[PDB]
């Protein structure tokens, strides 16, 4: 019996307005399957995947303008969220109690990503800095900087000693986190990036563009070893699966395509999300897919191993 | 308008403190002054039209 990718769920009104960030954490080995979402309404909602559905755990708040990025930590149960007022919160994930509130000046932080051991929480900056705030202990441990434009999207390598930083002009800079020495700068595109993703066993780096193209690069060089041209309009987010077999992409043309690295073609395409999709993610394995659109819908698709 | 007058003891207790409420900003932020007098809010006429 063929196990085809199935819609398998739709959630009609997750938030009161558009949804912008989704994180899926199989942090707890028990029935946690924590899903966290930020949605421009100054609310961060914690959901759980109980048997076949999402039941809200709680909605927790304190945010001035819309929320821009959320992230969930694998090692410890802990969440982190940044908004438009450059103000970062850390969430307990057991009481919703805001352990710490890292402030920030007018230009410090745009997006977030944890360290594999949940210690550094690298973040972008409107004027090019990639300064790092040590988790739970320190503030502005150091500031790795270049000369350049806005940095929308930031990627972090899984193993370490890599930190990829997209830019508004469309250029990528990769810095090794060990010391901060810029390895080499990739020209990238002539339009913004909005998403950067590495791979598990991180040797391949995939970049999403604002012109609809997707570029595959090899970490050892600046070899543009791939280019994908299926999405009509912009592409906003790209995520992999725990094996280097396929990734999900969520254009701004209301289409989510699941591409494959081996053949670099769209193996399957989904047609939902009446308005444009802003986030996509994978669960603790390759099985399940989460997509969040501008319309207030959470979607969980299936993708057998 | 029914009573038209009230007689009260102005120094009721010399231990206690009179309450002076000063209002700061449009978003709720009040404070308590010591010396007795008018309520004396800040920005009495509201925010200037910008």
């Amino acid at each position: 019996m063929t196990n085809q990718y199935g819609i398998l769920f739709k959630q009609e009104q997750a938030h009161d307005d558009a949804i912008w960030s989704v994180a899926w954490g199989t942090n707890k080995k028990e029935n946690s399957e924590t899903v966290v979402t930020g949605s421009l309404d100054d609310l961060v909602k914690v959901w759980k995947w109980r048997d076949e559905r999402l039941d809200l755990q709680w909605s927790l708040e304190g945010h001035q303008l819309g929320v821009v990025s959320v992230d969930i930590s694998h090692t410890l149960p802990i969440a982190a969220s940044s908004s438009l007022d450059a103000h970062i919160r850390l969430w307990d994930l057991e009481n919703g109690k805001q352990i710490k509130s890292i402030d920030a000046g007018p230009v410090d932080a745009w997006t977030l990503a944890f360290s594999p051991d949940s210690q550094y929480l690298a973040t972008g900056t409107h004027v090019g800095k990639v300064n790092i705030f040590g988790v739970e202990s320190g503030k502005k441990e150091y500031s790795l900087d270049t000369r350049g434009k806005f940095i929308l999207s930031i990627a972090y390598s899984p193993d370490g000693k890599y930190l990829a930083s997209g830019a508004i002009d469309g250029i990528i800079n990769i810095f090794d986190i060990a010391t901060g020495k810029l390895l080499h700068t990739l020209e990238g595109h002539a339009m913004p990036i909005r998403s950067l993703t590495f791979s598990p066993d991180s040797q391949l780096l995939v970049t999403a563009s604002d012109d609809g193209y997707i570029k595959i690069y090899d970490v050892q060089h600046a070899n543009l070893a791939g280019t994908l041209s299926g999405h009509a309009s912009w592409v906003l987010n790209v995520a992999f699966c725990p094996d280097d077999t396929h990734f999900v992409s969520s254009s701004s043309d209301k289409s989510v395509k699941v591409w494959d690295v081996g053949t670099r073609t769209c193996v399957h395409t989904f047609f939902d999300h009446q308005d444009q999709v802003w986030g996509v993610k994978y669960n603790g394995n390759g099985s399940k897919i989460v997509s969040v659109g501008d319309d207030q819908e959470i979607h969980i698709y299936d993708c057998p191993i | 308008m029914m009573e038209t007058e009230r007689l009260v003891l102005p120094p009721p207790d010399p231990l206690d403190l009179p309450l002076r409420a000063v209002e700061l900003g449009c978003t709720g932020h009040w404070e308590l002054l010591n010396l007795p007098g008018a309520p004396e809010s800040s920005l009495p006429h509201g925010l200037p039209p910008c």
Binding site: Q64 | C26, T27, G28, L47, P49
Partner: protein, 397 residues
């Protein structure tokens, strides 16, 4: 388009969406700051951040972005670390240096000076920056004269500046100058029922500053004058203060209630809390005199409940503490509530000192020396002069 439908929250959300799409474009950030200043001014902190970001990303948008961020800081209050070089006054001054052409910056300067006066008064060190209101008003009028047409907006700006200048003159104490200004203004043009209220306020300041009895003619005249220019909660709250001054409390309560209804129908939010807290203060203060006709505690109860329904006003919880302490002075509930007020953080200094003081009095009433020394060290770990001195004087009568 969204604002036409009166939605008034979607608007800010929509502009935030647009800025998220295109995180560059200083203009977009500046527009977000302006809308937050105008619509939904409860995300003041976000507005300040947005204005600063707009100013950073260029230089030629300095003008409007600095104006909007200064106004947002004004709306905020004094929610800072008492840090120099980043208060409202400094930013509005910077904007004034960049473009000394529009009248909004001069009005912002007026507001910043008044707010600084009030903050210094709170710290109770000195009123400063005393006499510049007349010059700024002249500047506002001169600047407005050269604007092509935003007629309604220009009228609003000039009217607000005039009112602010008169109030500032009243505050500093130069009654005669305010009087001459108002007389000249009324001799200029036919009467408008707003300025006459200002003339009433300037008139009635000497009188009622010293205890005196007033004739019913002036009081009825004042009430009619307030009715002339209705739909303005400030005026009504001031009239209620007048009632308290002579002392007709229930009438003051009614005036505050009318202001509350007016504010609630307008959808405003600050005015409603101002009216509720003011009414609660009136009833509790009148109760202080230990007066009969036990209805004022009920009014205190309802007002404080409404206040907590809206928001997290510390004054409301302290007010409940005082109501409980005064009526059925008691042993346990009052001490527990006072200690709860004075022990969890996130509370203003004055509230903490007052609650600490009353809890100290009740604890001295029911002697427990260990807790009393605990209170003494609590005072020590903060800065206080009055609780410890009173405890020392009355520990050995």
């Amino acid at each position: 388009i969204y604002a036409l439908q009166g939605r008034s929250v979607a608007v800010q959300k929509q502009i935030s969406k647009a800025v998220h799409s295109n995180p560059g474009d200083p203009a977009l950030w500046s527009l977000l700051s302006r809308v937050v200043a105008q619509y939904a001014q409860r995300n003041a902190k976000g507005g300040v951040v947005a204005g600063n970001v707009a100013h950073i990303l260029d230089s030629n948008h300095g003008k409007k972005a600095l104006l909007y961020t200064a106004v947002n800081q004004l709306a905020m209050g004094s929610s800072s670390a008492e840090d120099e070089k980043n208060t409202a006054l400094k930013t509005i001054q910077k904007a004034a240096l960049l473009s000394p052409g529009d009248p909004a910056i001069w009005a912002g300067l007026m507001a910043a000076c008044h707010a600084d006066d009030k903050l210094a008064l709170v710290n109770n060190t000195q009123p400063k920056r005393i006499d510049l209101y007349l010059a700024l008003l002249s500047a506002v009028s001169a600047s407005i004269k050269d604007e092509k047409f935003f007629e309604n907006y220009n009228q609003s700006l000039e009217k607000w500046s005039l009112s602010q200048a008169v109030t500032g003159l009243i505050d500093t104490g130069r009654i005669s100058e305010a009087e001459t200004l108002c007389t000249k203004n009324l001799k200029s043009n036919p009467d408008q029922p707003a300025v006459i209220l200002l003339l009433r306020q300037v008139q009635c300041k000497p009188l009622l500053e010293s205890q005196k009895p007033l004739p019913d003619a002036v009081l009825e005249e004042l009430q009619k004058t307030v009715m002339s220019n209705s739909t303005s909660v400030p005026a009504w709250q001031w009239l209620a203060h007048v009632y308290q001054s002579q002392g007709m409390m229930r009438a003051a309560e009614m005036c505050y209630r009318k202001s509350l209804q007016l504010a609630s129908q307008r959808g405003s939010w600050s005015g409603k809390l101002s009216s509720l807290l003011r009414l609660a203060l009136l009833a509790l203060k009148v109760c202080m005199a230990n007066i009969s006709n036990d209805h004022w505690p009920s009014l205190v109860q309802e007002a404080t409940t409404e206040a907590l329904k809206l928001c997290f006003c510390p004054l409301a919880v302290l007010l409940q503490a005082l109501l409980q302490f005064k009526r059925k002075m008691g042993a346990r509930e009052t001490r527990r509530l006072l200690e709860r007020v004075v022990y969890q953080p996130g509370y203003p200094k004055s509230i903490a000192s007052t609650a600490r003081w009353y809890l100290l009095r009740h604890l001295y009433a029911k002697d427990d020396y260990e807790l009393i020394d605990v209170l003494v060290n609590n005072a020590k770990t903060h800065g206080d002069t009055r609780a410890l001195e009173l405890n020392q004087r009355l520990s050995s009568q």
